[PDB]
A paper describes a structure:
The radical SAM domain includes residues 71 to 356 and corresponds to a full (βα)8 triose-phosphate isomerase-like fold flanked by N- and C-terminal stretches.
Brownish prism-shaped crystals that diffracted to 1.27 Å resolution were obtained. Inspection of the electron density map indicates features that can be best modeled as 5´-dA, L-methionine bound to the radical SAM [Fe4S4]-cluster and L-tyrosine. The carboxyl moiety is sandwiched between the strictly conserved residue R300 Nη1- and E158 Oε1-atoms. The phenol ring sits in a narrow hydrophobic pocket while the phenol oxygen atom establishes four polar interactions with the hydroxyl groups of the strictly conserved residues T299, S318 and S321, in addition to the main-chain nitrogen amide of residue T299, hence defining a square pyramidal geometry supporting anion-dipole interactions instead of hydrogen-bonding. Both approaches show that only the phenolate-containing models were able to reproduce the phenol oxygen atom interactions with the protein observed in the crystal structure, hence supporting deprotonation of the phenol upon L-tyrosine binding. Therefore, upon binding, L-tyrosine would be fully deprotonated, likely corresponding to NH2-CH-(Ph-O−)(COO−). In addition, as predicted when we solved the L-tryptophan bound NosL structure, this new structure confirms that 5´-dA• attacks the amino group of L-tyrosine in ThiH.
Numbering used by the authors: 2 to 367
């Protein structure tokens, strides 16, 4: 009884045959409905629905304001360590790449925490590579103990854990989990993850459930856009979010639509995803799950992020750095290349000028 059962059930679902049946009347009908099914969400991801993106954006904006107000939660990532045993083809930290492997000392964690907290942020997301030798759970726990002096919400985006390990970290102060399945098609997942513990598709797929079972307050998921058939991968992300929300009615479920960016190693995206595709996904997902967060990172350029402020995004990073210690070492190599280099203050000033209140604690979004 896990999401894997749903993946198994859709193994023979014929996406092309479904899209072939969609008509404009279907899209107009869905825009009149209060509740959407998962296949109504698939219809809003169809080529035919590209003719209705304005109507979708009008309603998506209304729904977002209804549930979140004219607010935007700000946060930033903190990469603690970049040791990794996995060979993910698309990642700057994959094992076969040559870079300075680094783990922050606890005093470096504290100093970077102070630097970030000095901008006003209260939500932090901490990341590591998969290395139980260099960045074990006990080290992550020690970092959480320091960070809780500065941040009221600490989320983890680390290697997948057991339920008991999630419970341990929640007991130390972790509030939220972000974990991207990367690709929901099992065959393509095996192709993208040729070596390491991350080759275990099902263990990763079930990680959000294990964390929710352990009591995680918030969970943020997402496919990595660029690895596989984008409409199917967007569909499965939404299907997964809906599954989690139904299995755990009191967890706050969110999605991210991260697009592949340049990175050390140079693997090019297996599939191309346009700006309009990204917008269609965000709009369709907002209409499918009106109360779910949508997180937009600095992978997107500033002009597109500015345009998406009113289109369903509820959480934005700012002042990001994808390299371990890169906030004080401009030559440090990041996991991938960011696009929007604006600081926290610059993103907050942009939001105020759009009539949106930047907020620093998630409970202020209503
Ligand atoms: C932390 C998250 O970053 C994403 N990730 C890994 N490599 C890249 C890349 N080249 N570009 C953009 N995002 C990436 C993965 O989805 C990973 O889970
Ligand atoms: N790549 C991670 C951490 C991150 C968050 C926001 C950024 O702007 C950059 C990196 C994520 O998207 O969850
Ligand atoms: C830094 S990538 C995100 C955390 C972990 N290495 C993963 O791939 O799940
Ligand atoms: S995505 Fe996470 S597991 Fe894969 S190489 Fe990068 S850091 Fe390692
Ligand atoms: Br029609
Ligand atoms: Br490991
Ligand atoms: Br919802
Ligand atoms: Br970089
Ligand atoms: Br900043
Ligand atoms: K030190």
């Amino acid at each position: 009884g896990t999401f894997y059962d749903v993946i198994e059930d859709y193994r023979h679902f014929d996406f092309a045959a479904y899209f072939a049946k969609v008509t404009d009347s279907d899209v107009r009908r869905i825009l009149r409905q209060d509740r959407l099914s998962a296949l109504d969400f698939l219809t809003l991801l169809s080529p035919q629905a590209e003719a209705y993106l304005e109507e979708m954006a009008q309603k998506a904006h209304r729904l977002t304001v209804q549930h979140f107000g004219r607010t935007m939660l700000l946060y930033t990532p903190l990469y603690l360590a970049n040791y990794c045993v996995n060979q993910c083809v698309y990642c700057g930290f994959q094992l076969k790449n040559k870079l300075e492997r680094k783990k922050l000392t606890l005093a470096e964690v504290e100093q970077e925490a102070q630097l970030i907290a000095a901008t006003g942020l209260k939500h932090i997301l901490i990341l590591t590579g998969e290395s139980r030798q260099h960045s074990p759970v006990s080290y992550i726990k020690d970092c959480v103990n320091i960070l809780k002096k500065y941040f009221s919400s600490i989320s983890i985006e680390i290697y997948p854990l057991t339920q008991e390990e999630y419970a341990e970290l929640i007991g130390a102060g972790v509030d939220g989990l972000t974990i991207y399945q990367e690709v929901y098609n099992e065959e393509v997942y095996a192709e993208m993850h040729p070596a390491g513990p991350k080759r275990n598709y099902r263990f990763r797929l079930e990680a959000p459930e294990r964390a929710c079972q352990a009591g995680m307050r918030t969970v943020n998921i997402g496919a990595l856009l660029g690895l596989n058939d984008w409409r199917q991968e967007a569909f499965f992300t939404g299907l997964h979010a809906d599954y989690l929300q139904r299995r755990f009615p009191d967890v706050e479920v969110s999605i991210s639509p991260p697009r592949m960016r340049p990175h050390l190693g140079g693997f090019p995206p297996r599939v191309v995803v346009s700006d309009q595709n990204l917008v269609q996904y965000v709009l369709a997902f907002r209409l499918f799950m009106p109360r779910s967060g949508i997180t937009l990172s600095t992978r997107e350029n500033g002009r597109l992020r500015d345009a998406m402020v009113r289109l369903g995004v509820t959480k934005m990073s700012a002042g990001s750095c994808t390299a371990v210690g890169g906030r004080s070492d401009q030559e440090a190599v990041g996991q991938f290349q960011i696009s929007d280099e604006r600081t926290v203050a610059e993103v907050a000033a942009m939001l105020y000028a759009q009539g949106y209140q930047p907020v620093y604690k998630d409970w202020q979004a209503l």
